[PDB]
Design a protein around this ligand. Structure first.
Ligand code: CL
Length: 441
């Protein structure tokens, strides 16, 4: 029920106070006001900002319905109508209604490439002036036309606190839908997800199944704490896709490689690092389809036996995977809650390393009809104190991607990390029965 989780005492006072400052349309009505998730704050603090671009060539294109769809798409999904301000220190998200979407449009000189115009607006003003926490609505649309409207670029701009890998194909789905004027099953929105989390919590916080699970799961764990800390480095390594042992997910293989690597350099038989879970394992409907950012970043814990036990790669793989699936029904809570209620660590403890495998959709489609549609994007992402390892399963390649600021992880160290991890994954694939101690890297 609307406003039941607002930290602000009079929400709509804050609303028109923004309307007055010309931040948000004065025609807009304040629907709800909830706090932002820790994961949301994570992305906003890192300037995670996206422009999904579609190059539409063909004789059909209805520019006016293209414009309609943008209004409609935004009407459907409350999160696309969300504005972020930070009053007191942690962010709140204000949801908007009665809000009509205006599209930025560009008619190019003859011969002027539309994508280049987009790139220019992007680097020129779009992202260098970005100030999501200021309240300006982050979702916004651009339409760049060749002289005759038969070569056009459509770009959606969005903050990662508003989408995830699970639901972003749904944004392109529901968009291509509305243009083709095709039925859509009603959807939930992201605020309803937040509500649904609060209810399935408990009266007593240490009576909660979930904060009881985490306390049991992290009993005796120690997190390694990096040393003293520039620019953002992306370091890549591609390999042959691993041949998975039966029962073993690709993300399991990846997360176990990381554990092995950490155990070796940390000289520890018990390691804890962060990984990304999709956060959609709640008993609610449309949770498969509702648009928003349900991703969470939670401890993955991997514990190795004493050397006498003489474990193999397969032991490690099976252990590592249940150390993930054990958490499925508990993976939706705030990280700070897990640390506050279930551990002795400061509630504001960061994850220093986050492994994120996307067994999600790497390819995107915007199927519009009477039309050649290409996909492409621009993206900003700028890590703080932490190191990211992203893995993507392509046809030709599994791609390991390390992302960290160079003040944290220099190119040589970033290169070695990507290489070493990739090599471990390959060895795991090769002889899944190898003794762990016969492993070199
Ligand atoms: Cl990202």
């Amino acid at each position: 029920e609307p406003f039941s989780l607002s930290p602000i005492k009079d929400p709509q006072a804050l609303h028109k106070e923004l309307c007055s400052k010309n931040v948000i349309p004065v025609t807009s009505t304040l629907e709800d006001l909830l706090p932002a998730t820790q994961a949301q704050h994570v992305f906003i603090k890192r300037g995670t900002f996206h422009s999904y671009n579609w190059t539409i060539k063909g004789r059909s294109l209805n520019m006016d319905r293209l414009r309609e769809t943008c209004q409609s798409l935004v009407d459907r999904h409350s999160i696309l109508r969300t504005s972020f301000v930070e009053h007191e220190g942690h962010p709140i998200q204000l949801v908007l209604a009665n809000l009509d979407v205006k599209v930025r449009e560009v008619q190019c000189w003859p011969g002027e490439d539309p994508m280049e115009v987009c790139k220019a607006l992007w680097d020129g003003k779009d992202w260098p002036t970005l100030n999501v926490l200021g309240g300006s609505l982050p979702v916004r649309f651009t339409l760049v036309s060749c002289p005759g409207n038969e070569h056009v670029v459509l770009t959606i701009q969005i903050s990662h606190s508003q989408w995830d890998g699970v639901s972003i194909p749904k944004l392109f789905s529901d968009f291509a839908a509305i243009y083709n004027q095709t039925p859509l099953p009603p959807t939930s929105d992201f605020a309803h997800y937040l509500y649904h989390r609060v209810s399935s919590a408990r009266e007593d916080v240490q009576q909660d199944p979930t904060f009881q699970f985490w306390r049991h799961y992290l009993d005796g764990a120690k997190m390694a704490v990096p040393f003293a800390p520039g620019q953002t480095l992306w370091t890549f390594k591609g390999i042959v896709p691993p041949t998975l042992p039966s029962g073993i997910t690709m993300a399991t293989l990846v997360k176990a490689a990381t554990a092995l690597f950490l155990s070796y350099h940390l000289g520890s038989r018990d390691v804890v690092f962060g990984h990304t879970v999709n956060g959609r394992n709640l008993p609610m409907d449309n949770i498969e389809s509702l648009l928003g950012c349900t991703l969470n970043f939670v401890p993955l814990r991997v514990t190795f036996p004493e050397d006498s036990t003489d474990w193999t790669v397969m032991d490690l793989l099976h252990h590592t995977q249940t150390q993930y699936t054990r958490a499925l029904s508990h993976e939706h809570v705030e990280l700070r809650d897990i640390f506050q209620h279930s551990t002795n660590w400061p509630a504001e403890t960061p994850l220093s390393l986050i492994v994120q495998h996307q067994n999600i959709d790497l390819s995107f489609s915007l199927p519009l009809r009477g039309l050649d549609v290409q996909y492409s994007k621009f993206a900003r992402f700028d890590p703080l104190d932490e190191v990211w390892i992203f893995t993507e399963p392509h046809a030709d390649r599994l791609e390991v991607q390390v992302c960290a600021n160079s003040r944290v992880l220099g190119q040589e160290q970033a290169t070695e990390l990507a290489n070493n991890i990739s090599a471990i994954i390959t060895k795991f694939s090769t002889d899944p029965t190898a003794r762990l101690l016969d492993i070199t890297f």
